[PDB]
Amino acid sequence: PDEITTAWPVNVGPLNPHLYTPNQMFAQSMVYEPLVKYQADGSVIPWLAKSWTHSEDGKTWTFTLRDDVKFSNGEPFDAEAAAENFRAVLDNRQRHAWLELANQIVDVKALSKTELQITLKSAYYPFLQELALPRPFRFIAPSQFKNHETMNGIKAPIGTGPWILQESKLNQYDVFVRNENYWGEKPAIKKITFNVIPDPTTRAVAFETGDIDLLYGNEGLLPLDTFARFSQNPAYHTQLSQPIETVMLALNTAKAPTNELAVREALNYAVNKKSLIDNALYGTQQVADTLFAPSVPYANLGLKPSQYDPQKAKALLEKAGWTLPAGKDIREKNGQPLRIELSFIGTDALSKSMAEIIQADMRQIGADVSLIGEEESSIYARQRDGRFGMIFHRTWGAPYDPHAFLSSMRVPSHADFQAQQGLADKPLIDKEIGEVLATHDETQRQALYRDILTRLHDEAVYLPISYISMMVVSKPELGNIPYAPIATEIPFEQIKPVK
Ligand SMILES: O=C(O)CN(CCN(CC(=O)O)CC(=O)O)CC(=O)O
Ligand SMILES: [Cl-]
Ligand SMILES: [Cl-]
Ligand SMILES: [Cl-]
Ligand SMILES: [Cl-]
Ligand SMILES: [Fe+3]
């Protein structure tokens, strides 16, 4: 085949390269390209920029751009187009706060058609890695700006990438076709249709009926019982990647009773994670003992796991004054029950399943977990504002983990800051996060990452649950389906049915 049909829970969005919801990162990465491209080994390679140099102080960077690249509408890609894109992004600077590069860029100038100069306020180390991300530093034809901006919308979603949006129908589908005037390698696939299918069971059904050819996504892609069955079905092809990121609970250090270190530590001994994974996730994921897997850059630190040990969990609670009243299973301290609210998306069957398991495990150690299932909007508002006891949370995968995930812990309107807000050493943690991003002493960088991650582990801010994987279900005719280096991209241009 050379046309494929796949599915996504939502439309790809209007494909503004510089904005977030409702734009889907993997679709922005199909159409728009970066100056430099992220590789699985952590390095970046030349992409729209063929080479670059930086000053001694590491604050000014000069990129030599390819001179052969056109936007899909035939307009040239050049340093002036790149500079206008940076201006457009930075004109919306406060929206990009989570990403420190957006706070670092002082100036971007086209010195010629091929020479682009970027100036930073400090020697920001993850500079190239952050240019490599799906958004916001990718390039739309400046003719498609609205009043010379993108923050208020764009006209046509015109990029330089291997795919061109053909058409979109809200709540129905999106169709992409191969860019026949692409500067790089031509994809084998000519057309990709995304059917919008919000429900994981309905996605599985669409595959079983032959309505779609490919499903690609994280642990939520389809029911995991069904995935296991599909993996044994000789008519189908399935894949499970190596783990890409962590799923955890975040505990609110500023809200009783999770404001108590002893409570947070006890919760971290109460969960048999292997059992949770075998029960709710059909044995398809890996147990997580730490916020970052030991395979994550800077995170191989010999941190001590809190292995499942309910006797220890009870002892920790007892020592902190949380004891069991006569005839009750829920602990009390100073008259107050040990009660914790777990908020999650109520219509997410998998979240609900894990929440039930967590509630059951915590009851065994005398903690009453109240399950609060709400719509997505409500849950995001709770995370932003710290209106939670516990929430499900995930890290962001490569290349965000650890530097960008850490960077964002400093932003008050995000779950991580909110979960951490009650820690006495939060200011120090935030100071050290600032310092790691700017340091060029590798020894100091490692020490800072060690200290930040060690404090977060030792303070039991998180309850890591699983390192989750990408999964794929496909018609055999499509062949082996590759994974992209960036956890949030889907490498459709690497699919090659005919070898
Ligand atoms: O989605 C956003 O608005 C920004 N992301 C930041 C990290 N994202 C990257 C992105 O959205 O560009 C990681 C991810 O969505 O996987 C979450 C946040 O600000 O807390
Ligand atoms: Cl937004
Ligand atoms: Cl979204
Ligand atoms: Cl499997
Ligand atoms: Cl009770
Ligand atoms: Fe995001």
Curated annotation (Swiss-Prot):
Q: Where in the cell is it found?
A: Periplasm
Cite the GO molecular-function annotations of the record.
heme binding; metal cluster binding; nickel cation binding; peptide transmembrane transporter activity; transition metal ion binding
- GO BP annotations, alphabetical order: negative chemotaxis; nickel cation import across plasma membrane; nickel cation transport; peptide transport
Is Transport given among the entry's keywords? yes
Gene3D superfamilies, per the entry? Dipeptide-binding Protein, Domain 3, Periplasmic binding protein-like II
NCBIfam families, alphabetized: nickel_nikA
Q: What does this protein do?
A: Involved in a nickel transport system, probably represents the nickel binder.
Protein name per its UniProtKB record: Nickel-binding periplasmic protein
Q: Which organism is it from?
A: Escherichia coli (strain K12)
Source taxonomy lineage? Bacteria, Pseudomonadati, Pseudomonadota, Gammaproteobacteria, Enterobacterales
